[PDB]
Amino acid sequence: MLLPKRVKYRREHRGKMRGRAKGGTEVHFGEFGIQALEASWITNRQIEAARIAMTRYMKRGGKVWIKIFPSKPYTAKPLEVRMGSGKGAPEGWVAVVKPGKVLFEISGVSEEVAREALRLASHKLPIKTKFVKRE
Amino acid sequence: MITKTSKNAARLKRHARVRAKLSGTAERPRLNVFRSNKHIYAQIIDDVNGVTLASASTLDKDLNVESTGDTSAATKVGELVAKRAAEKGISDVVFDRGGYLYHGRVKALADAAREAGLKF
């Protein structure tokens, strides 16, 4: 499960997800990849589920680059409390994904295997995606 | 291997520190002093325009001595710069010691300028 070794601030603002991805819009490292069509928070739990899904399908037979890192903390208040009395405790970790961001990249397998591996991963994620290739 | 900066480079750093405060107006121009290994020089400078109004040196022909670059030579320049400045119409000045210590040759030029008309 991915998380930062440490953070400067444990409680950050949620921020906003306007615009397309700043960088990582092309398949850089690998041969194939999966590109976000929609903005979302991707939790570290979703990344791990997506990672294991694609990795298991390939049968140790190819390399995976996770292009997103869940750096941003999110908080939650305890169950059944009123509003106020300070910000909630840190719960988990999210990567902020905007449209265009390549999430995972694969190499060392065929397009047929890569397509199916990345399909299986796509079903673990809360966003619409498309399969992409290096140009 | 020792590597060491020039004495002029260290002096220019000291001279910058002097010039941070001190500067020459048209009323009260800057009596700059450059001394060398062999010679000593003096310029009365107006910094707002950037013009040397008057000047004197050991390279001038009135100063005729073999021992240039000593205290006795500096007194002769300090007299000449001040008397030439009086013709131009310069009374008040600011002494720019030029990064050098106010001592010996540089002091002797200043003292001779004070003796021979100029007011600082």
Binding site: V81, R82, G84, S85, G86, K87 | -
Partner: protein
């Protein structure tokens, strides 16, 4: 039941920054810029106070100017 926050403090805002415009006439003593440190330097006929306040020494026109590469200065020039 609920906990509490350890935060909730702030100091009074100090109203820093420019107090006269470029091109504006100012009387001698007019504060031109309030600041911590020297975000802007004292230019011609401008003093720097004990708390880094820039103020006009003369009556004249305020001019915020570039000072070398990175720095800025403010000057007051006599009207003529």
């Amino acid at each position: 039941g609920v906990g509490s926050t350890k935060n909730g403090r702030d100091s009074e805002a100090k109203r820093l920054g420019a107090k006269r415009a470029d091109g504006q006439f100012v009387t001698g003593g007019s504060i031109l810029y309030r600041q911590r440190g020297t975000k802007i330097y004292p230019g011609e006929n401008v003093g720097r106070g004990g708390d880094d306040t820039l103020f006009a020494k003369i009556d004249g026109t305020v001019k915020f100017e570039r000072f070398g590469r990175d720095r800025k200065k403010v000057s007051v020039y006599p009207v003529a």
